[PDB]
């Protein structure tokens, strides 16, 4: 009978998270609940990682000359308009964690899943994962450099 590409269960992926990456995911989830959104999204995670200057996501934006305020406003205006019970992760966020773990465990040479790999996978498939506002903000970030020099570019990170 017909099968699709293998999917890893969410709790196995969450267990790969670096301890600080995981703490920020827990913050993203609380944020979602506080806002009464229906799904935890990559935007909620970004929103919280932006508050730590040594997150991988901050370190990438600093290197790209991007301002925290512009990314915050793009996120504020694309949050779900629905108000809701515990949310689920969005199916796009589950699938994103699985691609970012596959990249981490292979090309990035990372023992743990970090927000930098999650961000790199979303940027590498930005048509799939990024809203039009984020695409346009992040258009100039060099994915190949970030992939090839991941560990050095993000050497200052709290997620190491």
């Amino acid at each position: 009978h017909h099968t699709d590409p293998i999917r890893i269960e969410l709790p196995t992926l969450i267990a790969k998270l670096n301890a600080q990456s995981k703490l920020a995911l827990e913050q993203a989830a609380s944020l979602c609940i506080e806002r009464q959104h229906p799904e935890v999204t990559l935007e909620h995670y970004l929103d919280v990682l932006l508050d730590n200057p040594l997150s991988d996501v901050r370190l990438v934006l600093k290197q790209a000359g991007l301002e925290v305020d512009q990314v915050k406003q793009a996120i504020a205006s694309t949050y779900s308009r629905e108000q809701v019970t515990y949310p689920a992760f969005s199916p796009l966020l589950v699938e994103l964690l699985q691609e970012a773990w596959l990249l981490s465990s292979t090309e990035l040479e990372q023992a743990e899943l970090r927000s930098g790999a999650i961000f790199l996978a979303a940027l590498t498939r930005a048509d799939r994962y990024l809203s039009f506002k984020l695409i346009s903000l992040f258009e100039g970030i060099n994915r190949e450099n970030l992939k090839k020099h991941f560990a050095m570019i993000l050497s200052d990170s709290a997620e190491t």
Partner: peptide, 14 residues
């Protein structure tokens, strides 16, 4: 007992 992320993960399966 179940954490926030535990509850959210269960909802994700369901």
């Amino acid at each position: 007992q179940g954490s926030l992320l535990d509850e959210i993960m269960a909802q994700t399966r369901c």
